[PDB]
Amino acid sequence: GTVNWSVEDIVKGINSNNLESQLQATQAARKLLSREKQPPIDNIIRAGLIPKFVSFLGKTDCSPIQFESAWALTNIASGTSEQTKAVVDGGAIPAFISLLASPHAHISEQAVWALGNIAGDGSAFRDLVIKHGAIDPLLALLAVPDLSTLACGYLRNLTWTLSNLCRNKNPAPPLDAVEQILPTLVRLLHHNDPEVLADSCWAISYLTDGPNERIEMVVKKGVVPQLVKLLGATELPIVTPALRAIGNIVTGTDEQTQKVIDAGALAVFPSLLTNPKTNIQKEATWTMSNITAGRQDQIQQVVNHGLVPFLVGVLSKADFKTQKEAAWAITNYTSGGTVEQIVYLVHCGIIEPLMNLLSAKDTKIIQVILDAISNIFQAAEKLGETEKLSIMIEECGGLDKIEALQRHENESVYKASLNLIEKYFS
């Protein structure tokens, strides 16, 4: 019927002045654009069909052609930036927002989808969607006593589109748009659907990826305990954005970091720091490095939760970029911690895997490790036990690597090495 039409035939029907002929041709374009194997988006654009699709969005008395056009335009908007731009240039943004209030749920859902693709292109189209007034009708679709009464596919599309309005930087979304979206987002973050939960966490991870003021807007809505709960989910599509959000929050102030600790997040990190998915381990270790950059009472909580052995573990064996986050974790720890906390680090076995990483060719991890060694020696000087640390570094081959780095291209790997040799190995 409408399967495998030529673009020429589609143009012919759409250019007829017969609404039923145009409906059939539009559905045929929708089916062409729905195939996974290179949908001919550019050929449809080059045929000049986008203005006609957009005008069909307004045919209130022919809801089928509204749906088919909406679907066709959604899939053009799903392509490259240039292809999304063609949809925007055709006037689709206000026409889709007008469809949000359609009495046909499948048509308003398709308008939700299309705006999600347009907003997802980048911050400019995101902010342009916001300026046309998309947020109010979107949130009104979710203004129900219980989200569970909404169709699951519909709720997932609404959640995903809302998270694209939260997405991207330079610039971040407008402050007032974020404040307007946040209470609905908090409610979606407590819903029981795994996809809604994943996309809600993604939205929160975008909003917390910024300055401390952006983090605070989220943290003050009280979502940190729910994020920590989702941190323990069995669904990796949920854990990944939940962890990104938690890690984003601990890039903020010590007070914002403390609320992550208060919420019980550190008890999940034995699993996260041994998680089979290397990017979970990397993100978890980066998060740990920002926690060990906090106060001494926050370092103490890391100790209390038994997490220093887990840092020794990832330093000993992990993907290199995780090992580098672990190196940062130790340097931050030794920079801010007490003498007793630093001594405990040595007792857990940090020295030998620390020395082994001086073999790496990454020059700034060598700088990071050399700073941690200097920090630990400074703690050992306060105790009069510099020589035991010297011999410890000696027996694991660490001294050989320190004096090897005396022969290094970088000017500070140069001097840090010789300085440590000068003062502690004479």
Partner: peptide
């Protein structure tokens, strides 16, 4: 990598 855009197949 969470895709910003989504294509509708059916």
């Amino acid at each position: 990598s969470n895709p910003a855009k989504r294509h509708r197949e059916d």
